[PDB]
Tab-separated table of C-alpha atoms and ligand atoms in Angstrom:
chain	number	residue	atom	x	y	z
A	1	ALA	CA	5.153	2.007	11.465
A	2	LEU	CA	4.781	-1.100	9.312
A	3	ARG	CA	4.959	-4.797	10.070
A	4	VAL	CA	5.629	-7.855	7.958
A	5	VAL	CA	2.763	-10.338	8.055
A	6	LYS	CA	4.321	-12.525	5.366
B	1	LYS	CA	-5.745	-15.453	12.192
B	2	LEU	CA	-6.154	-15.357	8.406
B	3	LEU	CA	-5.247	-11.932	7.022
B	4	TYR	CA	-6.272	-10.350	3.718
B	5	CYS	CA	-4.874	-7.614	1.515
B	6	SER	CA	-7.123	-4.580	2.012
B	7	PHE	CA	-6.506	-3.470	-1.552
B	8	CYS	CA	-7.171	-6.574	-3.677
B	9	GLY	CA	-8.858	-8.892	-1.192
B	10	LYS	CA	-6.419	-11.801	-1.571
B	11	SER	CA	-5.575	-13.855	1.513
B	12	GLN	CA	-1.994	-14.097	2.763
B	13	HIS	CA	-1.870	-17.631	1.370
B	14	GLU	CA	-2.513	-16.312	-2.143
B	15	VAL	CA	0.235	-13.678	-2.176
B	16	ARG	CA	4.019	-13.691	-1.778
B	17	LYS	CA	4.223	-10.846	0.740
B	18	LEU	CA	1.780	-9.051	3.015
B	19	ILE	CA	2.613	-5.845	4.875
B	20	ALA	CA	0.399	-4.251	7.502
B	21	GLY	CA	-0.183	-0.813	8.916
B	22	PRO	CA	-2.831	0.207	11.497
B	23	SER	CA	-5.848	-1.932	10.565
B	24	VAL	CA	-4.745	-2.086	6.923
B	25	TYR	CA	-2.875	-4.618	4.781
B	26	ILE	CA	-1.269	-4.588	1.339
B	27	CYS	CA	0.326	-7.385	-0.701
B	28	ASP	CA	3.301	-7.436	-3.067
B	29	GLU	CA	1.039	-7.520	-6.106
B	30	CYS	CA	-0.725	-4.310	-5.106
B	31	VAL	CA	2.543	-2.656	-4.097
B	32	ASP	CA	3.835	-3.584	-7.562
B	33	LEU	CA	0.888	-1.883	-9.250
B	34	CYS	CA	1.293	1.128	-6.969
B	35	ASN	CA	4.875	1.472	-8.194
B	36	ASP	CA	3.651	1.466	-11.792
B	37	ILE	CA	1.204	4.229	-10.894
B	38	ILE	CA	3.866	6.312	-9.157
B	39	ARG	CA	6.398	5.781	-11.958
B	40	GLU	CA	3.665	6.551	-14.501
B	41	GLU	CA	2.834	10.117	-13.457
C	1	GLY	CA	-14.179	17.387	-1.902
C	2	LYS	CA	-13.551	15.312	1.210
C	3	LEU	CA	-10.186	15.092	2.986
C	4	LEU	CA	-8.658	11.680	2.268
C	5	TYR	CA	-5.741	10.186	4.180
C	6	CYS	CA	-3.195	7.444	3.699
C	7	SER	CA	-4.370	4.483	5.778
C	8	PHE	CA	-0.794	3.634	6.727
C	9	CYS	CA	0.786	6.941	7.790
C	10	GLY	CA	-2.192	9.268	8.215
C	11	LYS	CA	-0.950	11.994	5.865
C	12	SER	CA	-3.625	13.678	3.754
C	13	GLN	CA	-3.835	13.877	-0.029
C	14	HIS	CA	-2.607	17.458	0.388
C	15	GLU	CA	0.657	16.316	1.995
C	16	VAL	CA	1.778	13.625	-0.444
C	17	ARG	CA	2.729	13.348	-4.113
C	18	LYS	CA	0.234	10.577	-4.809
C	19	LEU	CA	-2.596	8.806	-3.001
C	20	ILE	CA	-3.845	5.463	-4.287
C	21	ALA	CA	-7.219	4.025	-3.340
C	22	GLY	CA	-8.306	0.473	-2.727
C	23	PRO	CA	-11.969	-0.418	-2.019
C	24	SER	CA	-12.077	1.345	1.360
C	25	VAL	CA	-8.421	2.126	2.085
C	26	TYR	CA	-5.649	4.405	0.814
C	27	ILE	CA	-1.861	4.396	0.499
C	28	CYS	CA	0.510	7.249	-0.346
C	29	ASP	CA	3.692	7.195	-2.428
C	30	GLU	CA	5.860	7.509	0.680
C	31	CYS	CA	4.406	4.378	2.246
C	32	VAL	CA	4.610	2.563	-1.087
C	33	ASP	CA	8.327	3.388	-0.885
C	34	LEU	CA	8.610	1.880	2.596
C	35	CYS	CA	6.845	-1.250	1.365
C	36	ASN	CA	9.380	-1.479	-1.461
C	37	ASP	CA	12.320	-1.410	0.949
C	38	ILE	CA	10.676	-4.207	2.930
C	39	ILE	CA	9.872	-6.358	-0.094
C	40	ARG	CA	13.374	-5.628	-1.401
C	41	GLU	CA	14.835	-6.396	2.031
C	42	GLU	CA	17.557	-3.737	2.179
C	43	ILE	CA	18.130	-0.167	3.373
D	1	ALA	CA	-9.017	-2.595	-8.518
D	2	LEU	CA	-6.705	0.258	-7.511
D	3	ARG	CA	-7.655	3.819	-8.431
D	4	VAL	CA	-5.687	7.057	-8.307
D	5	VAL	CA	-7.053	9.744	-5.983
D	6	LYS	CA	-4.064	12.014	-6.561
E	1	LIG	ZN1	-3.262	-6.940	-2.855
E	2	LIG	ZN1	1.420	6.968	3.783
């Protein structure tokens, strides 16, 4: 899983 | 909380994009270089 | 000769096409691909 | 800087 910080 | 790219050390305010995995971060600039590496060999 | 793993997906160097190292982290070609889709914003 | 492990 990945997440967008910016 | 201020986050930093784990690969180049730049803060989120110094890059255009910042993506995170489990306790790891990577910016657009590093991703860009990674693509060059992958497309290189 | 130590087993190195992608910091994002956990796959080892022996499971991916390429493994790239930062100071104390690693990323494989597969995860670089996922990051591209995100930065590109399309699937 | 980035370095190639594989
Ligand atoms: Zn970076
Ligand atoms: Zn990976």
